[model samples]
Target chain A: MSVGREFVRQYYTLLNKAPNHLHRFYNHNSSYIHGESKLVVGQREIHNRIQQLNFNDCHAKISQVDAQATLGNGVVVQVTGELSNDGQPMRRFTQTFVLAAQSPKKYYVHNDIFRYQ
Target chain B: MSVGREFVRQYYTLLNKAPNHLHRFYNHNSSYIHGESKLVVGQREIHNRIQQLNFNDCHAKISQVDAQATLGNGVVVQVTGELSNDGQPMRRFTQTFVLAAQSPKKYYVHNDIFRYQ
Candidate 1:
């Protein structure tokens, strides 16, 4: 898988299994999210928001991903997919992540926007 | 309407009626897009991409919008909507825009991510 796809898989894996550890993938003070129904800023706040999600039986399946692209000083990944919870009808979802390099092979999400259809 | 909603409306209006001037809404030096099937950067490049879209009989109608929020030094707007072309079945779309301040009440799109469902 490409780096963008790998990163997205890892993100959803942790989101479904370890909400508390999500801070590690974010830029903390510089991270932010414009969610379907909420707006959160900072890694700490984002973590708190994640904790409220009921991912007990949820799994994310990315149906399509746009090729990774570079912005002024960051990278952007856009994916459109679905979320299945308790084997019910899948719900449509789209997520966009803006990443900033933390190291040669490490990156952190600087901005995340999500929408549910 | 809020500034966010108004800006989106005006954006689509010009996009359908006068795409040639859409450059004014973007930060030419820093604008970028991770679209469903394309990756574009810079104002001139982004303008070229936009020009390629066939909006001869298209209209963008926003169905839902999240409250505008500040992210780092910019404003983030998340919207879920649809695009109607030649009055056919509407196609679902989700757009996220990262806007930077150009003036007290003026903002330019720094990054835009678009997805079709």
Candidate 2:
């Protein structure tokens, strides 16, 4: 699979098994810039955000993923998925991630946005 | 209506009546950061991206919009809308936008992201 696909898969995998298992992969000093809210930038914070939003049982499909085209400064992923709450169609959304490079083999998603339309 | 509410109303109004007319409201040198694509960085380019995506129709209803919450540097809006293509349900998408202050009443949307589930 391509880097984009891999990233999507890894994201879902980690996200679905979150809270209990996924919190180990976060950087302690990491931060999430959610519009105007800046939350803890660590694994625990990531876990909490998902939990707080009740982001349970998500199936993320990367309709478009372009990492190479992201000016090579970061990875930009555009994804669309069927999201639901309590097995009901909540809404469809597209979110973009501007990931910053932390290490040669690792990256941090420092900025992100999601639109429901 | 508050700033956020007004922004949403304006957004939908302008977006629905776009392409031919909305192009005029944009600054000649504005930029849109869409994934890795940095097109013309002007009004013409903005018109084209929406057109290119076949974004012919969009009902961008701001389910959540916040201006005051932003750090005065910008306004952040979170919205959810039922979107379709050709009258058929395409998917649900959530996107966030970061509006930068240009002067006082004018702000430019410099960044955005969408997620579809």
Candidate 3:
């Protein structure tokens, strides 16, 4: 129930303030969607993809988080909010996370879809 | 590939024009997100949840559809667009779908995350 919330509590801030270890959240089979362009898979490729985006330049204000269990194990979290670059206009965005539990309280992103609206 | 596009083609229209069968797109392992509220799994529950919302009054105009292969088998599709009722204002929306193949060219929704942005 609170797994999604707890996971989210750390993810956004991790990507914003300290993203060097963001790659640790993914597995070799990870799938990530970058806006309306494409979906990138593999932890290595995903890390490379984020580097190109310059996560340090971004700031996020998450407004909503909704989630549910998958096959009674994984969690599907859907989030909506505003994101912006420093000194830039904000953009409306939505992100979906389908994560599998690594430990009872820890998880890794199996699939993620993000889009700017 | 074109698998995601093809699946999406009949999906939206099926939910809008003839939603009675929309439940078929899912399997017992299915996961469906209803806005930022909760996600519903199981073919039966997902169908029941959608019936409560009355799909007859809904219309969708998709703006973006980005997809990628999952584990070289399944597909992950992320969609962003606008949705409206018969006589109401439209709302911005984003929906994510992770589908697994039943046949080489046919698939079913394994996970879905939908949100109004």
TM-scores of all predicted structures: 0.79, 0.53, 0.84
Q: Can you give the DockQ of every candidate in the order shown? A: 0.30, 0.14, 0.36
**CA deviation > 4 Å runs, candidate 3:** A36-38, A71-73, B36-39, B71-73
Q: List candidate 1 segments past 4 Å from native.
A: A1-3, A30-36, A67-72, B1-3, B30-36, B67-72
Error of 1 at A52 (Å): 2.6
Query: What value of lDDT does candidate 2 attain over all alpha carbons?
Result: 0.52
Please state the i-RMS of candidate 3: 3.6
Q: By the TM-score metric, which is better: model 1 or model 3?
A: 3
Q: What does candidate 2's lDDT look like per residue over B1-117, in tens digits?
A: 155556666766876666456545446644454434544356778777767766466555345553322333444444555455445664544544445567778766554444443
Report lDDT per candidate: 0.68, 0.52, 0.76
Q: What 10-residue stretch in candidate 1 chain A is worst by lDDT?
A: A66-75
DockQ for model 1?
Answer: 0.30
TM-score of chain B of each: 0.83, 0.66, 0.91
User: Interface RMSD of the predictions, in order shown?
Assistant: 3.7, 6.9, 3.6
Residue-level error in angstroms, candidate 1, position B32: 5.1
Model 1 CA lDDT for position A66? 54
Number of the predicted model whose DockQ against the real structure is largest: 3
